[PDB]
């Protein structure tokens, strides 16, 4: 998978075989780093109207 966002230390407990998270509205939410066995939350980068 590919995307843009900020990776942060997560609070979830992924199963040993789960890789990619998913929110309710079919949006990627967290990922499992392939090398380090740590789960990273993907918070999309800040934006807003001017």
């Amino acid at each position: 998978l590919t995307g843009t966002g900020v990776l942060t230390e997560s609070n979830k407990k992924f199963l040993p075989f789960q890789q990619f998270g998913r929110d309710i509205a079919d949006t990627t939410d967290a990922v499992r780093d392939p090398q380090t066995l740590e789960i990273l939350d993907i918070t999309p980068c800040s934006f807003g109207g001017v």
């Binding site: 843009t4 949006t27 918070t43 999309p44 980068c45 934006f47 807003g48 109207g49």
Partner: protein
């Protein structure tokens, strides 16, 4: 089954027989109305073409779709603000009830603001608030009037109604004992005022019971 419209009840009509009530009840009903939506706004460029220059270049061919969509959503948000403003902001000033609650026996403590409360909301207001329950170009603009301000507006309207009757709407608020205001209202419904003064305690108790029943209904049924 074939649904029944209602219970059959033939009226004993007769050319020289009338039926006159001898007693009454003071019933409090509840009517719920929506006033506004959530002020949603969508950024078409980021939704359609999230972080992609080529996609944006292709999208720029379609003219001014985004301008009119954003304009429509902005108009929607403005319209919601206007709706709330016109529904609630109908009192020129912010009246507040005096500490004395000598309202002819009527008890409004369940609708007047609670000085020890989360956001100065009344009991029924708090019940209503408690009985009701991202970054992909979709945002939710905040309403112009925060719930505290709407609570203040309802408090001003309620205090005006309690301490002045209807005069506070027509012009300057004119105080009046609540019993005399209810006498006005009874005269307004074709029941002479002496009915009130001779049955003041009963009417006050009935009103309190009705408010309690409304409280229980709201607390029980979500």
């Amino acid at each position: 089954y074939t649904m029944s419209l209602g219970a059959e009840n033939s009226v004993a009509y007769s050319n020289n027989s009338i039926a006159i009530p001898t007693n009454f009840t003071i019933s409090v009903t509840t009517e719920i109305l929506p006033v506004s939506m959530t002020k949603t706004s969508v950024d078409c460029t980021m939704y359609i073409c999230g972080d992609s220059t080529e996609c944006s270049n292709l999208l720029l061919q379609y003219g001014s779709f985004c301008t009119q969509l954003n304009r429509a959503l902005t108009g929607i948000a403005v319209e919601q603000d206007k709706n709330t403003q016109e529904v609630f902001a109908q009192v020129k000033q912010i009246y507040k009830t005096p500490p004395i609650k000598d309202f002819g026996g009527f008890n409004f403590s369940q609708i007047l603001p609670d000085p020890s409360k989360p956001s100065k909301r009344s009991f029924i207001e708090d019940l209503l608030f408690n009985k009701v329950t991202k970054f992909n170009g979709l945002t939710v603009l905040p309403p112009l009037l925060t719930d505290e301000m709407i609570a203040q507006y309802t408090s001003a309207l309620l205090a005006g109604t309690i301490t002045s009757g209807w005069t506070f709407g027509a012009g300057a608020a004119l105080q009046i004992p609540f019993a005399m205001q209810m006498a006005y209202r009874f005269n307004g419904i074709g029941v002479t005022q002496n009915v009130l003064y001779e049955n003041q305690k009963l009417i006050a108790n009935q009103f309190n019971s009705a408010i309690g029943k409304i409280q229980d209904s709201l607390s029980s049924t979500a």
